[PDB]
Amino acid sequence: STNLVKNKCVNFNFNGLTGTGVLTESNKKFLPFQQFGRDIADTTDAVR
Amino acid sequence: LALHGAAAYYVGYLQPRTFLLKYNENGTITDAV
Amino acid sequence: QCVNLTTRTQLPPAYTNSFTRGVYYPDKVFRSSVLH
Numbered sequence: 189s190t191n192l193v194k195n196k197c198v199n200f201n202f203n204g205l206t207g208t209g210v211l212t213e214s215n216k217k218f219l220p221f222q223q224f225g226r227d228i229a230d231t232t233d234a235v236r
Numbered sequence: 237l238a239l240h241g242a243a244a245y246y247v248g249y250l251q252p253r254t255f256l257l258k259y260n261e262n263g264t265i266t267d268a269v
Numbered sequence: 270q271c272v273n274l275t276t277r278t279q280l281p282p283a284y285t286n287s288f289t290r291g292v293y294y295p296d297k298v299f300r301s302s303v304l305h
């Protein structure tokens with residue numbers, strides 16, 4: 189594992205899920221049994 | 237059950253259905269069709 | 270040891286209606302502000 193870098197476009201791997209993008213702090217509150225958040229187009233837009 | 241008191245229990249059976257669930261802005265299911 | 274309970278009055282079964290009950294979360298993905 190590496191360090192977490194924010195506000196820059198970065199290739200990322202979270203628990204095996206890979207992608208590209210910019211990471212920002214979120215106000216969403218996940219229930220304890222969930223790990224990913226998905227929007228209307230079904231793509232992952234939030235992560236614990 | 238337990239023995240020595242007021243209790244009432246209800247039983248229903250599930251079927252395969254299609255539901256339309258509603259998620260509010262906090263992520264909780266508040267309504268369904 | 271097992272004991273067969275006696276002194277129990279027998280009554281016909283009763284039925285009622287479920288008013289939009291029994292909904293659970295189908296999966297473990299967070300969603301907000303959406304019809305799914």
Ligand SMILES: *[C@@H]1O[C@H](CO)[C@@H](O[C@@H]2O[C@H](CO)[C@@H](O)[C@H](O)[C@H]2NC(C)=O)[C@H](O)[C@H]1NC(C)=O
Pocket residue numbers: 271272273
């Ligand atoms: C409670 O009643 C049941 C009968 O419903 C008894 O079970 C019977 O036991 C005898 C002797 O062991 C068997 O020949 C029957 O086949 C059994 N019936 C059933 C339906 O299983 C049971 O023994 C009673 N419990 C007591 C007396 O403590």
Ligand SMILES: *[C@@H]1O[C@H](CO)[C@@H](O[C@@H]2O[C@H](CO)[C@@H](O)[C@H](O)[C@H]2NC(C)=O)[C@H](O)[C@H]1NC(C)=O
Pocket residue numbers: 284285
């Ligand atoms: C709920 O299910 C029960 C069981 O099928 C229904 O009870 C039957 O109702 C019919 C018509 O009233 C009677 O002819 C049967 O004899 C009833 N069966 C029993 C075991 O009582 C009941 O009507 C259904 N609906 C409601 C609202 O109770």
Ligand SMILES: *[C@@H]1O[C@H](CO)[C@@H](O)[C@H](O)[C@H]1NC(C)=O
Pocket residue numbers: 260261262
């Ligand atoms: C959503 O969360 C906020 C903040 O905790 C709360 O005030 C509100 O009552 C919750 N429910 C709805 C429907 O907004």
